[PDB]
Design a binder for this molecule. Structure first.
Ligand SMILES: CCCCCCCCCCCCCCCCCC(=O)OC[C@H](COP(=O)([O-])OCC(O)COP(=O)([O-])OC[C@@H](COC(=O)CCCCCCCCCCCCCCCCC)OC(=O)CCCCCCCCCCCCCCCCC)OC(=O)CCCCCCCCCCCCCCCCC
Ligand SMILES: CCCCC/C=C/C/C=C/C/C=C\C/C=C\CCCC(=O)O[C@H](COC(=O)CCCCCCCCCCCCCCCCC)COP(=O)(O)O[C@@H]1[C@H](O)[C@H](O)[C@@H](O)[C@H](O)[C@H]1O
Ligand SMILES: CCCCC/C=C/C/C=C/C/C=C\C/C=C\CCCC(=O)O[C@H](COC(=O)CCCCCCCCCCCCCCCCC)COP(=O)(O)O[C@@H]1[C@H](O)[C@H](O)[C@@H](O)[C@H](O)[C@H]1O
Ligand SMILES: CCCCC/C=C/C/C=C/C/C=C\C/C=C\CCCC(=O)O[C@H](COC(=O)CCCCCCCCCCCCCCCCC)COP(=O)(O)O[C@@H]1[C@H](O)[C@H](O)[C@@H](O)[C@H](O)[C@H]1O
Ligand SMILES: CCCCC/C=C/C/C=C/CCCCCCCC(=O)O[C@H](COC(=O)CCCCCCCCCCCCCCC)COP(=O)([O-])OCC[N+](C)(C)C
Ligand SMILES: CCCCCCCCCCCCCCCCCC(=O)OC[C@H](COP(=O)(O)OCCN)OC(=O)CCCCCCCCCCCCCCCCC
Ligand SMILES: CCCCCCCCCCCCCCCCCC(=O)OC[C@H](COP(=O)(O)OCCN)OC(=O)CCCCCCCCCCCCCCCCC
Lengths: 469, 89, 59, 50, 64, 183, 167, 81
């Protein structure tokens, strides 16, 4: 039903004016909500890990992928509410947070390309869908074209995505040159013994992984995440991560991988010690993505990782989405707005935040202790259930390096708190205009999932016991 | 496999060690894609199937749309800055 | 009256321990092709590519 | 208005005022982090396509 | 119990409406009807999750 | 008769030669013209292997649309370029040589499946045996290669043609949406 | 001749508690067997999109002041709401063919209709204008496509001979 | 003890030496991508080194695993210092 949305939408956007664009996104927001509500019941198809293959050995549908599908729709309902709703009714925030005409077009085409990977069985479905989502990230980066940094970032992202698309294509055709086959379904655990498919499947994994931000090739993605504006970057950070990783976690082609294990160690090291002496908030906030994409590369080495993965996915997605939404709200309280596309940059700009909207600091605290892994919060059971899979399966040096990486990464997480709970000379006493009710309810909902979401751990596991076993 | 691998590796190193302009980087990308095509088309001929030819005729179109998208990205890059640097972006 | 309410809780926890050990065994158990691939079309046998087909190419 | 801003390791970090976008600050040599002079600010653009 | 899950999920809804009032720099009881609105919405999510868990237990009972 | 034997090897050498004139040419559009020559060498190799259909698909699509697009860009836009001076790329030369050796050999490695690394490479070179082509009378109609592509793009992989339509749509919408400046 | 499946097929392979009706029902049969609660789901989604847009403006308006949305948006809200209602409708009704929800009402209809085609001396699933290889390929495309209703709409219109059932 | 042991040497294995270690290591790994004027040529030559260097490591590695441990210690020394 994304197809019908795109086909209806681009015809509808061709006829609307510029001033209509905002309200169009509101429509699409509600549309996606009634694809969650009125169409969820398809989970009843997937009892006892019954898997389907649709369109003839082409798309594989299990309930792992159904959950990834539902997660991607939920986060788009959020991101679409960020574009489609005003923050305040000022003359300021209309020229700072304003959608383009064709923005929601590229959004839905991107989600289409990201779903056709997690649902994918074939390799040409994999390649066409990676190409579709890669074009969409090209154009979502370059759509705010009256910005020097965003155009430079779109060009950088074009060439570095072109190399790692031709590396994937070379790995697919290298796999074809030794097996007249397109599926990893053909592998079926006898062939891997008598066939040297190490170097092929590992090179395929790498060419898929370097697009995430794994650490030998991590600098260019941190540059794109700092150069893009503040609304584009909470989408292009989240979507290729969860799409490409839930591809590679579903098909288990790097087990006992020594190369994935080196790159997981190297990722947890230079992500935690990378973002220490840094002063820009999107930088600081983009090396948090490097370490938390490091905790996934561990699970690639695993067999049977579908609990640790999915729980830590929706953990990172809610925590991610919430900490980006908080520093949208701190823009009213800063004393200095530069750079219209990216209005808050330096992390010392949110300094007096406890004396002006103290419960924004309560919100910020609750989400940032969840990144560290504090046990009343939902981030801790995510790190816990990763640890239960790492220690089960023989990765003992990986585990202590995970722990040292978590301890180093707590420093620049707590730097946000250190800066936020400080004295400020000039405090706000009263504000005329207040924040959007339907948009601040989303942040309150995203906290109450993080705070009081350890409640349902038991229920989820029992539901997890039925539909995946 | 010699012609496709040699086109791919020489085009790849010409892309990497490009410091002189940017249109050499685009055309090194396209010559890479040609090399991956050549390797696959030979594997289709040697294995007696259209299967790799199916992936070939799809990746022809995807190389095309990659050119169209990325060269519009370059025109966007050039719009604000009336010259393209020699050292790169 | 307190030792019996001990034993009720310990029975209720050994039930969960056996429940977990079972549900961990149920994962590593191998699965049929009709359950782990498409239910409809339960054979892996192809007969694929039939236009100019040669008799004797079956095995 | 702190005496010394902090930088997550106790280092000294620059407080970013409006006064960091000049001609000498333009095209300095540095990593892409810890850097002022953005390319997009309403005093650096100054009728950018007129 | 079905009832305690309803009351507690409605309590989660009261918490979301409270925290959403108080980010806005409003008083607590600013718009009192929205407490009812959010409480019934999050209670409905409690309805859904409880019924899915009922059905999953009933599937586990039929495997004997 | 045996003058017509080394053709494939000639094209390989010729293709090698063409890439050195692509990466080292003073004018840009002269090097893009050498790339057009490399497409022609590719289409020579594709006729030469037995795929006469593809050669004309390359001349139609790559030469006639993608290269025309590239030349059309280079005309009315500004691109600085520096010449291949010895002083700026002599520092690159050792990593060039190391990467030539490693990437070439390791590209030649995965066509083969012995556990011993040296046996992987030598199987790359043992091709001098001549395949025997036998006439089988089992096919009754002139299904060419393009007919079979049109049967498999349209029945077995119709969804890939349809997701491909979404990609071609995106290739329309994108360049437009960048270069509009609506109102 | 145009009725041989030439395949091996799972036989009465129930997807839940309840016995299956089809492995993919034809579009005509799904539109025939849907309950009045299903047309209620369609009507619910036709009404929920314009009321949802007017609601979501009444929460926080676009231009600072509350006005109603234009009829231009209400017309497209009605259309996309009928689209959501039909997608939910088709998915609900196809679940009863697969045997994952209650289908005791529809199973008697299928006993009756498969008994009526035997008395009328015609094919059990339809004469179709396709060669049997194209019927098999077309319904390998259309098999179990109600999963993945989130990505793309796909339906069955081919009268192909296999539906996961004996005889 | 209160100066040379308690506040001297237990802080060098404690919070006062770890700050200096992480300061140096972070300064090195941030200045790793510093030098080049063009980001594109730097990242495009950094994609080359890895798929070269990882491949050479795996060549060394299946023969003997003991002779690749110091190689990785030295790569960590050059990356982080
Ligand atoms: C779909 C819903 C809308 C259906 C339209 C009405 C069709 C109808 O009712 O007539 C039934 C009619 C029943 O015939 P019958 O007399 O009852 O019995 C004889 C058998 O059908 C005969 O079966 P057979 O085996 O003998 O023959 C093989 C079969 C061959 O047909 C097939 O096999 C179809 C194969 C493709 C299936 C396509 C499924 C939908 C795909 C959507 C796109 C996917 C995008 C994914 C992106 C990635 O049938 C045919 O030969 C007929 C083909 C005729 C070609 C003309 C089709 C015109 C298409 C444009 C329609 C314009 C409508 C008017 C304007 C509105 O069957 C047809 O006429 C086939 C129509 C095919 C139209 C498919 C295109 C639909 C595109 C709309 C999709 C968006 C819908 C959004 C829904 C939202 C929910 C999520
Ligand atoms: C981009 C543009 C496109 C460029 C194309 C040109 C080149 C393309 C090739 C590059 C491809 C991308 C490079 C990717 C990195 C290479 C990835 C790679 O090494 O996998 C290696 C292959 O183990 C060789 O035996 C590998 C030996 C390879 C021989 C080394 C090279 C020979 C150089 C001669 C001088 C395997 O990993 P792995 O940890 O799972 O393997 C382990 C472990 O090694 C084994 O002991 C275990 O038995 C096995 O189960 C597994 O646990
Ligand atoms: C498993 C977990 C998965 C998902 C759980 C997530 C969310 C729960 C789902 C649905 C939650 C549904 C909530 C609907 C009821 C919530 C609710 O009281 O209305 C709204 C927010 O309404 C949403 O913001 C509606 C936005 C819904 C989007 C939620 C996405 C997060 C809050 O009232 P409010 O006093 O601020 O609204 C007033 C009043 O309506 C106006 O008349 C006044 O003019 C104005 O001052 C305004 O303040
Ligand atoms: C054997 C070693 C024994 C290890 C014991 C654990 C030591 C933990 C530890 O040192 O406190 C920390 C964190 O340091 C790590 O990064 C956390 C520790 C990283 C290493 C984890 C422990 C290693 C175990 C290896 C197995 C040292 O930074 P820190 O806060 O003082 O750094 C500064 C400074 O103290 C103040 O003057 C500044 O005002 C302020 O900006 C502040 O940030
Ligand atoms: C009327 C329909 C209402 C629409 C509901 C839409 C929800 C979209 C949201 C997606 C992400 C949010 C997390 C949802 C968790 C579902 C768990 C599940 O059940 O997941 C299980 C297993 O999960 C996993 O592996 C681990 C995921 C763990 C989630 C961690 C977050 C916990 C805190 C939030 C959950 C409790 C909040 C309840 C508040 C009253 C499989 O998924 P399933 O196939 O059983 O899907 C159920 C179908 N349901 C949605 C219609 C019921
Ligand atoms: C005529 C139109 C105008 C009148 C509207 C009439 C509509 C009828 C229904 C009214 C809604 C009543 C039912 C919901 C109860 C909400 C009552 C309320 O106003 O909020 C309770 C409290 C703030 O209430 P208040 O005493 O006014 O304090 C404000 C200044 N401190 O705030 C809280 O305590 C929230 C804390 C919730 C956390 C609970 C967690 C444990 C469960
Ligand atoms: C995420 C967590 C959200 C939890 C929400 C729970 C709701 C608290 C209900 C208690 C209550 O009755 O609150 C009423 C009170 C009224 O609001 P008020 O600020 O007084 O309005 C004045 C208008 N002039 O409002 C208050 O008294 C403020 C209540 C806010 C509670 C925040 C706690 C701050 C952090 C304390 C440490 C955490 C405690 C738990 C640790 C375990």
């Amino acid at each position: 039903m994304l197809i019908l949305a795109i086909i209806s939408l681009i015809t509808f956007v061709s006829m609307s004016k510029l001033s209509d664009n905002r309200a169009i996104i509101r429509l699409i927001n509600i549309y996606l909500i009634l694809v969650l509500v009125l169409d969820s019941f398809l989970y009843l198809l997937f009892l006892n890990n019954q898997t389907y293959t649709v369109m003839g050995e082409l798309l594989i549908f299990n309930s792992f992928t159904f959950y990834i599908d539902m997660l991607i729709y939920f986060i788009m309902i959020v991101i679409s509410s960020l574009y489609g709703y005003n923050l305040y009714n000022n003359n300021l925030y209309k020229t700072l947070f304003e959608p383009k005409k064709e923005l929601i077009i590229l959004f839905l085409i991107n989600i289409l390309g990201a779903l056709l990977i997690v649902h994918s069985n074939d390799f040409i479905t994999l390649f066409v869908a990676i190409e579709l989502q890669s074009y969409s990230i090209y154009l979502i980066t370059a759509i705010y074209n009256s910005s020097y940094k965003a155009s430079k970032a779109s060009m950088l992202y074009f060439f570095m995505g072109g190399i790692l698309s031709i590396l994937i294509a070379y790995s697919i055709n290298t796999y074809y040159s030794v097996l007249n086959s397109y599926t990893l379904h053909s592998l079926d655990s006898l062939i891997i013994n008598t066939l040297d498919l190490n170097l092929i499947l590992i090179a395929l994994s790498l060419g898929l992984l370097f697009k995430i931000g794994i650490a030998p090739l991590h600098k260019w993605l941190i540059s794109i995440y700092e150069n893009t504006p503040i609304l584009i970057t909470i989408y292009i950070s989240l979507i290729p991560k969860i799409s490409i990783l839930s591809y590679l976690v579903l098909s288990n082609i790097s087990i006992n991988s020594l190369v994935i294990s080196i790159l997981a160690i190297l990722t947890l090291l230079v992500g935690s010690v990378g973002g220490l002496l840094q002063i820009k908030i999107k930088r600081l906030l983009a090396f948090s993505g490097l370490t938390n994409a490091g905790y996934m590369m561990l699970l690639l080495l695993l067999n049977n990782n579908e609990f640790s993965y999915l729980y830590y996915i929706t953990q990172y997605s809610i925590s991610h989405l919430a900490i980006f939404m908080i520093i949208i709200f701190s823009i009213y309280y800063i004393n200095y707005i530069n750079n219209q596309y990216n209005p808050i940059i330096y992390v010392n700009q949110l300094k007096g935040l406890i004396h002006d909207n103290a419960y924004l600091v309560l919100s910020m605290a609750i989400v940032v202790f969840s990144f560290i892994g504090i046990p009343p919060l939902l981030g801790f059971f995510g790190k816990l259930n990763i640890l239960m899979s790492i220690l089960n399966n023989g990765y003992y040096f990986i585990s202590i390096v995970l722990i040292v990486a978590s301890l180093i990464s707590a420093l620049y997480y707590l730097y946000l708190l250190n800066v936020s709970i400080q004295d400020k000379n000039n405090i706000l006493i009263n504000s005329n205009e207040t924040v959007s009710s339907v948009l601040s309810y989303i942040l309150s909902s995203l906290i109450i999932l993080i705070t009081f979401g350890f409640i349902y751990n038991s229920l989820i596991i029992d539901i997890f016991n039925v539909y995946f076993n | 496999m010699f012609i496709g691998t040699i086109i791919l590796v020489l085009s790849f190193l010409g892309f990497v060690f490009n410091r002189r302009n940017i249109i050499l980087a685009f055309i090194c990308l396209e010559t890479m894609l040609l090399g991956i095509n050549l390797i696959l088309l030979r594997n289709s001929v040697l294995f007696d199937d259209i299967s790799g030819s199916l992936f070939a005729i799809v990746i022809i179109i995807l190389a095309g749309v990659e050119s169209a998208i990325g060269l519009s990205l370059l025109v966007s890059y050039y719009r604000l800055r009336g010259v393209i640097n020699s050292y790169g972006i | 009256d307190i030792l019996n309410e001990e034993a009720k809780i310990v029975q209720a926890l050994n039930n969960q321990r056996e429940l977990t050990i079972k549900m961990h065994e149920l994962k590593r158990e191998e699965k049929d092709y009709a359950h782990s691939y498409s239910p409809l079309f339960s054979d892996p046998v192809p007969q694929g590519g039939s236009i100019g087909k040669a008799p004797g190419s079956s095995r | 208005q702190d005496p010394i801003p902090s930088g997550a390791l106790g280092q000294k970090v620059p407080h970013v005022d409006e006064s960091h976008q000049d001609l000498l600050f333009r095209t300095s040599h540095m990593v892409e982090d810890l850097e002022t002079y953005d390319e997009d600010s309403p005093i650096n653009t100054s009728d950018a396509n007129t | 119990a079905l009832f305690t899950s309803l009351v507690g999920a409605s309590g989660l809804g009261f918490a979301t409406k409270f925290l959403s009032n108080k980010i806005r720099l409003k008083p607590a009881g600013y718009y009192p009807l929205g407490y009812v609105f959010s409480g019934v919405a999050w209670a409905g999510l409690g309805l859904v999750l409880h019924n899915v868990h009922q059905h999953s237990l009933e599937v586990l009972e039929k495997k004997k | 008769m045996y003058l017509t034997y080394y053709f494939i090897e000639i094209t390989i050498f010729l293709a090698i030669l063409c890439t050195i004139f692509i990466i080292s040419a003073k004018n840009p559009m002269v090097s893009i013209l050498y790339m057009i020559a490399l497409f022609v060498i590719a289409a020579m190799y594709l006729y030469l292997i037995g795929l006469g259909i593809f050669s004309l698909l390359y001349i139609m699509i790559y030469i006639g649309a993608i290269a025309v697009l590239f030349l059309f860009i280079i005309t009315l836009l500004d691109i600085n370029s520096t010449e291949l001076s010895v002083k700026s790329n002599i520092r690159d030369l050792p990593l060039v040589l190391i990467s030539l050796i490693v990437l070439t050999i390791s590209g030649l490695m995965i066509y083969s499946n012995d556990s011993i690394l040296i046996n992987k490479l030598l199987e790359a070179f043992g091709n001098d045996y001549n395949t025997i082509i036998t006439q089988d009378w089992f096919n009754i109609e002139n299904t060419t290669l393009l007919t079979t592509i049109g049967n498999v793009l349209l029945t077995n992989n119709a969804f890939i043609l349809l997701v491909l339509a979404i990609v071609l749509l995106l290739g329309i919408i994108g360049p437009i949406s960048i270069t509009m400046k609506h109102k | 001749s145009s009725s041989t499946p030439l395949v091996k097929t799972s036989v009465n392979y129930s997807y839940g508690d309840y016995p299956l009706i089809d492995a993919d029902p034809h579009f005509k049969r799904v539109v025939g067997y849907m309950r009045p609660s299903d047309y209620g789901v369609i009507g619910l989604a036709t009404a929920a999109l314009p009321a949802g847009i007017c609601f979501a403006e009444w929460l926080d308006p676009v231009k600072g002041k509350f006005a109603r949305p234009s009829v231009k948006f209400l017309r497209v809200a009605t259309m996309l709401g009928f689209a959501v209602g039909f997608g939910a409708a088709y998915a609900r009704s196809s679940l009863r063919f697969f045997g994952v929800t209650e289908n005791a009402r529809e199973y008697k209809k299928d006993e009756a209709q498969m008994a009526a085609r035997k008395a009328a001396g015609l094919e059990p699933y339809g004469t179709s204008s396709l060669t049997p290889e194209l019927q098999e390929i077309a319904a390998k495309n259309s098999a179990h496509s109600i999963a993945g209703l989130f990505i793309f709409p796909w339906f069955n219109f081919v009268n192909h001979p296999y539906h996961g059932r004996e005889q | 003890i209160a100066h040379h042991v308690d506040k001297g040497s237990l802080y060098r294995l404690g919070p006062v030496g770890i700050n200096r270690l992480l300061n140096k290591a972070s300064y090195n790994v941030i200045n790793l991508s510093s030098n080049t004027r063009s980001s594109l040529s730097m990242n495009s030559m950094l994609i080359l080194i890895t798929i070269v260097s990882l491949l050479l490591l795996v060549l060394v590695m299946n023969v003997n695993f003991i002779i690749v441990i110091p190689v990785l210690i030295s790569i960590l020394y050059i990356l982080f210092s």
